[PDB]
Design an enzyme around this catalytic site. Structure first.
Site, PDB file in Angstrom:
ATOM      1  N   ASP A 184    -138.463  29.397 -22.788  1.00  0.00           N
ATOM      2  CA  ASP A 184    -138.673  29.966 -21.588  1.00  0.00           C
ATOM      3  C   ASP A 184    -138.755  31.208 -21.163  1.00  0.00           C
ATOM      4  O   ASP A 184    -138.028  31.803 -21.133  1.00  0.00           O
ATOM      5  CB  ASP A 184    -137.805  28.923 -20.503  1.00  0.00           C
ATOM      6  CG  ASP A 184    -137.928  29.253 -19.539  1.00  0.00           C
ATOM      7  OD1 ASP A 184    -138.419  29.649 -19.004  1.00  0.00           O
ATOM      8  OD2 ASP A 184    -136.964  28.810 -18.436  1.00  0.00           O
ATOM      9  N   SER A 220    -154.188  38.699 -13.031  1.00  0.00           N
ATOM     10  CA  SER A 220    -155.350  38.913 -13.190  1.00  0.00           C
ATOM     11  C   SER A 220    -156.405  39.533 -13.177  1.00  0.00           C
ATOM     12  O   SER A 220    -156.034  39.731 -10.885  1.00  0.00           O
ATOM     13  CB  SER A 220    -155.249  37.014 -12.880  1.00  0.00           C
ATOM     14  OG  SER A 220    -156.644  35.986 -13.780  1.00  0.00           O
TER      15      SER A 220
HETATM   16  N1  LIG Z   1    -139.382  29.469 -16.137  1.00  0.00           N
HETATM   17  C1  LIG Z   1    -138.493  29.470 -15.141  1.00  0.00           C
HETATM   18  N2  LIG Z   1    -137.012  29.474 -15.363  1.00  0.00           N
HETATM   19  C2  LIG Z   1    -138.603  30.464 -13.647  1.00  0.00           C
HETATM   20  C3  LIG Z   1    -137.512  29.739 -12.796  1.00  0.00           C
HETATM   21  C4  LIG Z   1    -138.305  29.920 -11.554  1.00  0.00           C
HETATM   22  C5  LIG Z   1    -138.862  30.545 -10.746  1.00  0.00           C
HETATM   23  C6  LIG Z   1    -139.109  31.483  -9.887  1.00  0.00           C
HETATM   24  F1  LIG Z   1    -138.776  30.442  -8.753  1.00  0.00           F
HETATM   25  F2  LIG Z   1    -138.399  32.640  -9.942  1.00  0.00           F
HETATM   26  F3  LIG Z   1    -140.399  30.758  -9.362  1.00  0.00           F
HETATM   27  C7  LIG Z   1    -140.159  31.198 -12.021  1.00  0.00           C
HETATM   28  C8  LIG Z   1    -139.998  31.237 -13.544  1.00  0.00           C
END
Ligand SMILES: N=C(N)c1ccc(C(F)(F)F)cc1
Length: 328
Positions: A35, A197
């Protein structure tokens, strides 16, 4: 040093990808969701509430001769799903690359969505270590720990469409992409691989030059973009609509979806229409869920797997980080 591991979709929709990771001595192999949008390496374990484990492979620190409790350390993370627990240090290897003393966050509790997904044994975070949730002493990611030892301070994501792909650490496989890699600036201010982007096109349409700030996130399934962009996309699909009841854009399963192009500097990455189909909203339905959705309400645009799988992506962790994208 380098490492190279295959990453495999968990299901027929590419909802997420799992990569085998060796933890402890002797090795305990768990399949983790890499992740790039978080920074905790956490696992289902022998400490996880029994009723919250359903088919996952668990890490048992008491069976590892190299495991050590990180005394006093706890962690807790939300993604509506969540998990929390305590922390060990142990030896962790990915595709032949070994880190000693890696923080392995052992889950005492996981939310229902984790329990319900038997295929994911935990997460391996690859965002910046500033997002790591361990308290009172923040811990480093696997990549951060490995970086100094790597031949080059990079990792690459090469996700497959309905097929396996590869995570490499420490080198760029020049046989894995076509043309050249275009690099673009990263802001680490929010702890993410955040970039801008240069615009988009829908199908064979003209390219719209417009700055779209967002994160390169292997841990998010879909492509989340501003409502204006998403509306322009779905307007090209007969019968597509945003459904508040379903929770996003849906389209007739009989449709042929147009491609979606995003800009990386002067370069272009084309997401084939097929990549944007997430299948029936419920079993047997003729309404299909879209793979491009609005980021309105999230607070950030997210270049998730739908976008990333169309590219060979370089996560360059040099002193000034950058991102690279190539077609493949
Ligand atoms: N890949 C993740 N663990 C993840 C989770 C939440 C967000 C957010 F809430 F900020 F959008 C962004 C990325």
């Amino acid at each position: 040093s380098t490492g190279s591991a295959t990453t495999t979709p968990i299901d027929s929709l590419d909802d997420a990808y799992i990569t085998p990771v060796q933890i402890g001595t002797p090795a305990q192999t768990l399949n983790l969701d890499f992740d790039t949008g978080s920074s905790d390496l956490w696992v289902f374990s022998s400490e996880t509430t029994a009723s919250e484990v359903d088919g996952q492979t668990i890490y048992t620190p008491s069976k590892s001769t190299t495991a050590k409790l990180l005394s006093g350390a706890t962690w807790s993370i939300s993604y509506g799903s969540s998990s929390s627990g305590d922390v060990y240090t142990d030896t962790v290897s990915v595709g032949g690359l070994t880190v000693t003393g890696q923080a392995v966050e052992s889950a005492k509790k996981v939310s229902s969505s984790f329990t319900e997904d038997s295929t994911i044994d935990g997460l391996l975070g690859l965002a910046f270590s500033t997002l790591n949730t361990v308290s009172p002493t923040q811990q480093k990611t696997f990549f951060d720990n490995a970086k100094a030892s790597l031949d080059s301070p990079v990792f690459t994501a090469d996700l497959g469409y309905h097929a396996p792909g590869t995570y490499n650490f420490g080198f760029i496989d020049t046989t894995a992409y076509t043309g050249s890699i275009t690099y673009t600036a990263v802001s680490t201010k929010q702890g993410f691989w955040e970039w801008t982007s240069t615009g988009y096109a829908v199908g064979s349409g003209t390219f719209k030059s417009t700055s779209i700030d967002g994160i390169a996130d292997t841990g998010t399934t879909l492509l989340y973009l501003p409502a204006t962009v998403v509306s322009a996309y779905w307007a090209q699909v007969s019968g597509a609509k945003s459904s508040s009841s379903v929770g996003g854009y849906v389209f007739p399963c009989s449709a042929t979806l147009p491609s979606f192009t995003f800009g990386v500097g002067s370069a272009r990455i084309v997401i084939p229409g097929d990549y944007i189909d997430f299948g029936p909203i419920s079993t047997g339905s003729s309404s299909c869920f879209g793979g491009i959705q609005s980021s309105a309400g999230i607070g950030i645009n997210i270049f998730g797997d739908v976008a990333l799988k169309a590219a060979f992506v370089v996560f360059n962790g040099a002193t000034t980080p950058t991102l690279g994208f190539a077609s493949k």
